[PDB]
Amino acid sequence: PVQQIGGNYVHLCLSPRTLNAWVKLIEEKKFGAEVVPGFQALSCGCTPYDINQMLNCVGDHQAAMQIIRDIINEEAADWDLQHPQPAPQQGQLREPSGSDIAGTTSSVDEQIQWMYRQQNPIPVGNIYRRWIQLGLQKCVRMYNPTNILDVKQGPKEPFQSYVDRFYKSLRAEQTDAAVKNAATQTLLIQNANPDCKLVLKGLGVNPTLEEMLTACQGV
Amino acid sequence: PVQQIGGNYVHLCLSPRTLNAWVKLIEEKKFGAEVVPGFQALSCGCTPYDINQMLNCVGDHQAAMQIIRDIINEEAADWDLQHPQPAPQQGQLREPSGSDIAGTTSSVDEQIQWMYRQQNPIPVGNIYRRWIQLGLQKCVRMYNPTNILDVKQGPKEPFQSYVDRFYKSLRAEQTDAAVKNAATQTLLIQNANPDCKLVLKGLGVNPTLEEMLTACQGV
Amino acid sequence: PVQQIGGNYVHLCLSPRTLNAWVKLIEEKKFGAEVVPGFQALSCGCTPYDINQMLNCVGDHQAAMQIIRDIINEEAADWDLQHPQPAPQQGQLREPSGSDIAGTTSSVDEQIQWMYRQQNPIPVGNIYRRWIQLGLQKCVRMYNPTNILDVKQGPKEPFQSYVDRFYKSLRAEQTDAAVKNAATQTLLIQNANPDCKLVLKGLGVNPTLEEMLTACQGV
Amino acid sequence: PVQQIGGNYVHLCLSPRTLNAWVKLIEEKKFGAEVVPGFQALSCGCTPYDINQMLNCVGDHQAAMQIIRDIINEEAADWDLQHPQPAPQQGQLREPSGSDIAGTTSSVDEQIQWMYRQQNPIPVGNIYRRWIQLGLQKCVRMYNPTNILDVKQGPKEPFQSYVDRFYKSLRAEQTDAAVKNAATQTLLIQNANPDCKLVLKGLGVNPTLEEMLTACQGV
Amino acid sequence: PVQQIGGNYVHLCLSPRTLNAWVKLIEEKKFGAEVVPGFQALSCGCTPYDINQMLNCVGDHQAAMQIIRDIINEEAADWDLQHPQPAPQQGQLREPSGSDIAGTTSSVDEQIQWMYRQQNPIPVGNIYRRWIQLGLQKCVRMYNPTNILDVKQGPKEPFQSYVDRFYKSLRAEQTDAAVKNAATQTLLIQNANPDCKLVLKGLGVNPTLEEMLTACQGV
Amino acid sequence: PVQQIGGNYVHLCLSPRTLNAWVKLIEEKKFGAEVVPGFQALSCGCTPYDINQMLNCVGDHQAAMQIIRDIINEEAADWDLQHPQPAPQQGQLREPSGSDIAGTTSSVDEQIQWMYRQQNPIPVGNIYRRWIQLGLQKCVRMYNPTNILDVKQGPKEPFQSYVDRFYKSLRAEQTDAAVKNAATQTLLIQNANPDCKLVLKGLGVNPTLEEMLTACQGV
């Protein structure tokens, strides 16, 4: 992270506690949806230099890390098109390229200068965090064990259990379309078992989740 | 959370310790009544941005999380009726809608501005915490294994044990009516076993819990 | 707890560490005598708002929690008799009732005002802690497995072991009378086994614990 | 402990970490010699109020705690003889009795006043810590499994092992006399086995421990 | 590390937490690629004196530690050639040799002087960290269980699994050449099994990792 | 440790965390070479008073602790010869003897005065740490399971494994002579098995460790 000592902004060492919590999250949860807000929280206040330490401390899951790296490169390339950089005049620090934001071609002090300079500050750490989020969302989709369309209530599975599996798989899609609404509720009802579906059909148009759970308790 | 640096209020990163304690509470306790004060303590001093990280780090129990989301939307809609928002004049920050308080349509800095502005501060974090409490109370009711009306003392169950189960289920109702008083004490006596009920009938009108426990010890 | 920021006293969030230590104490020790100083230490510097979070985070043992609640109400009622409260003149904060000290009818900021106001400060947090101590002492008596009068040395039980059990049960009474003195020492000797009692009778009037342990070692 | 806020000395809450470490030390080590420096370290900077919380959080070993209490009373009585206290003139805080130093008849604020007053400060916390040390030393002797005089080298026990047991039991005496010197070394040699004793006799007068260990390696 | 007290820079004790995390990393991960960023993070802000404590606390793996020591000596010798040091005039601190940067011939205070002196500061801690990184990279290669050229997809091994093993071994090379590009992708395809290779051949020139994983899912 | 409050240097309580880490190091690692830098790190910034708490908290291994005590006494005696102390004139604090540096005849405040006095400060804590290091080095030699001269490669033991054992035993000597150089490398080659020795003989004069490991891989 960053700290202020005197009238200057200087690197603050990344906590080993934070670093270890990130490493444990990956080892234990293996790209469940919670990895996305997990990274956001644990990378809060970080420079790209700090973020790369977090990512490089992951010892396994290298296919997923490579996918993340590929998404970082796409966004880095897109950045260069949206913000081409004229050659720094008079020995002044350049404007950051995509690789600079990713921390591959920039130092910690350069990153801090862009982040905390008075005129036209660029939050390169927070931009890089956004790129990694997109990569992690691809990984959640990749590691999802059961696609939403294959979530079907078992003959004797409690309705509450089926609903848990349904919304977990729906969330694992990681898209704006895969959210609770009339269209996704239609699928939920459709893929319920015959006994529960018969009960759900009697609840009218667009019943609430609470109504559905109440009505199907014990069926 | 929030911190003061100079004469400005700025985001303070949420502690990984706090975040992990919340995640563990859900995984281990699974919506027992203690989840309500647990959230209150662990979300103390938080902005809606921080609170959403807490809620989104929950990997399972998505039916319950959806119920919470539904209650948040109801309260968000109710807020818009009670406090409609005129269009911000002169490039000034708008007054917050329900979605702004929930952190879905607002940034961390907007949340902090509403919370710490001099004129007419709005504690959007604490309002959002109240909405989530209502959602968690619904979940406690949902996860309650034994309804209060089905708590009946076994033939040879110690009276103290039965009382523990009774007040645990009573509390799990999460209502103003489900509290120790003459009416709920009447049910407690009613659903005691024949041996203990005979002893309790001799203690007069409205005996104290201590009197009931003393009188029934060993029966 | 409370903190000073500028010239104002404001709420300080309760540590999750402290909260978890309290919850673990109850789960693991189950109202052994150490629960009383345990609460005192862990509730140090707390407002009634903070204390209620501690108490409400207890998920089981609800008979005991209800006993505590009953003692709180008795002391709250007693407070209202000793300190009736005239109606606040001129929009000034009222003087606290029993329910205000218990945190049921007061906010955190009201509690802090009473605690840190210049004229006639009232330590409502420390008063409430005293009420809860009385409740916890009742619970220690309730959970005590062996009454002091039933602690009798076994035929071949080492004297040191018997003494441990005796003073543990004596302490579990939680009264001023149940303390080491000539009267309770008389019971200790009385309930020793024939072999140790014969040795203890030869030590004169009011022998010390060290003398008793030395004399009975190996008997 | 104590802290300075403004120009005043005020109580600092005892850390739950410290308190728990003390409780665990007793439960796990059960009055081995290390309990004495352990208490000293963990009670560093404490008032008698804080120290009593530490001691009262011990749930078992009440014979030992009573022995400690008896030693505290002896030292408290001795204090009253060495420093009788005239009656406080003019509503000024009294000079502390033995019971005041022990924290039984004094509050935290009285303890802090004696500790940090300008004229004739009395470190009541550190005096009380000395009294408890004397009590803990008695307990180490009591819990010692093998008296020094019964530590004898086995027929085939390695000399290094025997030496470990010897100095552990010697230390457990907790006296000035029970220390490594010519007299205690004479006993060590005396209670070695015939094979090692023959080797030790050839090392001259007052051989060093290193010489003894070197000479007996493998015998 | 270093701290400022008054107008002077003084040693800050290395945290036991950090030290223990380093020791555990070596014991548990045994020179997997993550040891390199792990050292970088855990040695952040350290002087050579602090770094040597970290390295010397490693109790096993002494062949690897000797390899690190050999690389340190090479870089130390190279430093002396690039920056020969004239004899300090007038009792002034010398310019640092290679052994001074390694902390073998310099004290903590000398290291801090070079690091924080106004004119021509030399970051000896960060230079030494670079030397150790080179040593750790050699160790990663040494401990790598499967050379990249021996990573071949099994008859029925899922393509995702094979890809994980491939990029883990590729990374374990620790060279600029061993990175995802057209040349290394050619090897990945080449060493896939007949069923997956047939599918991969139909994806055109330089297919993306995502395309390869999508195309081979379930083959 | 020490802290500055106002214009005065005062004792800072030793952290229970640090103390516990030292105790665990001894219990778990039992005088492996890492105990030496371990003590150095964990005793950083300590007074002799603090160091004695660390050493006295060790409950077992008393032969080793006595060896340490014997080395402390030798160095203490040597100090008195090198720095005899004239009698303090005019009620001024004496110059420290060997026993004062060891903390046996001095208080914490005396130790701090010597450490932080303006004229002729004496770092008694750091001098004492040096004495204990010498004692711990003797203990490492004592606890070493396999003497360097008895480390011989097994018929089918991998060369890397043999090298680990060799350098671990070499280091356990704790002398300037027992370091990697031409002479100790000669022994390493000499005590390799016939198959590896034949390979090593072909590598010329003074081959590097890397060359030896590369050449012998799989033999």
Numbering used by the authors:
A (entry chain A), B (entry chain A), C (entry chain A), D (entry chain A), E (entry chain A), F (entry chain A): 1 to 219
Q: What do the paper's sentences say?
A:
HIV capsid has a pivotal role in regulating viral DNA synthesis and shielding viral DNA from cytosolic sensors. Previously reported X-ray structures of HIV-1(M) CA hexamers showed two distinct conformations with respect to a channel at the 6-fold symmetry axis. The beta hairpin structure (BHP) above the channel can assume ‘open’ (His12 forms a salt bridge with Asp51) or ‘closed positions’ (with a bridging water molecule between His12 and Asp51). Inside the channel, 6 positively charged arginines (R18) are hypothesized to mediate electrostatic nucleotide recruitment to fuel encapsidated DNA synthesis.
